[PDB]
Amino acid sequence: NALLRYLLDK
Amino acid sequence: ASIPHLILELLKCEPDEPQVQAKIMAYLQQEQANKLSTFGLMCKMADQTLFSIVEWARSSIFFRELKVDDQMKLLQNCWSELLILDHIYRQVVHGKEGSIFLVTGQQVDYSIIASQAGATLNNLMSHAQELVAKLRSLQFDQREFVCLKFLVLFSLDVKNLENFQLVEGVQEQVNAALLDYTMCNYPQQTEKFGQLLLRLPEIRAISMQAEEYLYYKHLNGDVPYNNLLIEMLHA
Numbered sequence: 709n710a711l712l713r714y715l716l717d718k
Numbered sequence: 719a720s721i722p723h724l725i726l727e728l729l730k731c732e733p734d735e736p737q738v739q740a741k742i743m744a745y746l747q748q749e750q751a752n753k754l755s756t757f758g759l760m761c762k763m764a765d766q767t768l769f770s771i772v773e774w775a776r777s778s779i780f781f782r783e784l785k786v787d788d789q790m791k792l793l794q795n796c797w798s799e800l801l802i803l804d805h806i807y808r809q810v811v812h813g814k815e816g817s818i819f820l821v822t823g824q825q826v827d828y829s830i831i832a833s834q835a836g837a838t839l840n841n842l843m844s845h846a847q848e849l850v851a852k853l854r855s856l857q858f859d860q861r862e863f864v865c866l867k868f869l870v871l872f873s874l875d876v877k878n879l880e881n882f883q884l885v886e887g888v889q890e891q892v893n894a895a896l897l898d899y900t901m902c903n904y905p906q907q908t909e910k911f912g913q914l915l916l917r918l919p920e921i922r923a924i925s926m927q928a929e930e931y932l933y934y935k936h937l938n939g940d941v942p943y944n945n946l947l948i949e950m951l952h953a
């Protein structure tokens with residue numbers, strides 16, 4: 709789940 | 719007054735949901751203007767709700783402290799349950815049985831929405847509103863709502879965590895705080911705390927059934943492309 713990771717790191 | 723301090727810290731994490739309401743309805747007003755089934759509309763509303771839920775989690779005390787892998791695991795273990803709990807608490811806050819209130823704040827007759835759903839989602843909505851009724855009869859307030867949200871996010875059943883002890887401690891702290899608050903502010907309703915806790919497995923069962931229903935409907939090509947919703951579903 710790359711979208712959730714980008715959301716959590718952004 | 720009569721609120722433990724931990725619960726105030728948890729309340730500090732609640733979003734200015736008037737503004738969130740406005741922004742979600744603006745997003746949909748804009749998207750629809752550029753043929754969208756009711757089911758797809760609900761899917762996109764849930765997608766925006768999921769974005770807001772992620773923003774709430776990464777705003778949480780304790781949660782920021784976690785490695786991003788742990789955050790991912792917790793969020794993908796509890797996103798469905800958080801959605802169902804938010805729906806139920808919305809209905810409780812508005813408390814007009816025979817109607818459904820959406821994340822947009824829009825009220826729509828339960829009749830006209832249920833008419834458009836299959837047997838699965840109709841059963842799940844009936845169960846959700848039975849829970850709404852019971853929680854209303856217990857005077858479910860916002861403090862207990864956020865305590866339950868944190869108990870659901872920081873679940874004891876999520877394995878393969880690095881900092882499981884942090885989640886255990888958060889569970890202990892929030893459980894004690896909710897116990898204290900509920901029994902001190904509602905001596906009216908002893909065993910209200912145990913009842914609140916008994917409602918969590920039921921919300922969880924509803925959440926899981928709904929999650930798998932939307933997963934299988936997506937595999938069949940009936941879930942319009944919702945980025946984060948579908949991403950949460952696949953994993």
Ligand SMILES: C=C(c1ccccc1)[C@@]12CC[C@H](NS(N)(=O)=O)[C@@H]1CC(CCCCCCCCCC(=O)O)=C2c1ccccc1
Nearest residue numbers: 757760761763764767805820821834835836839842843846
């Ligand atoms: C999890 C939800 C959901 C998300 C996407 C699609 C369907 C449901 C929510 C959770 C809240 C969220 N609200 S929202 N739209 O404002 O984000 C969603 C609205 C809501 C009420 C659904 C009624 C629509 C059904 C008509 C077509 C159904 C076609 C069919 O049968 O195949 C949900 C809810 C699901 C279970 C139990 C209790 C409630």
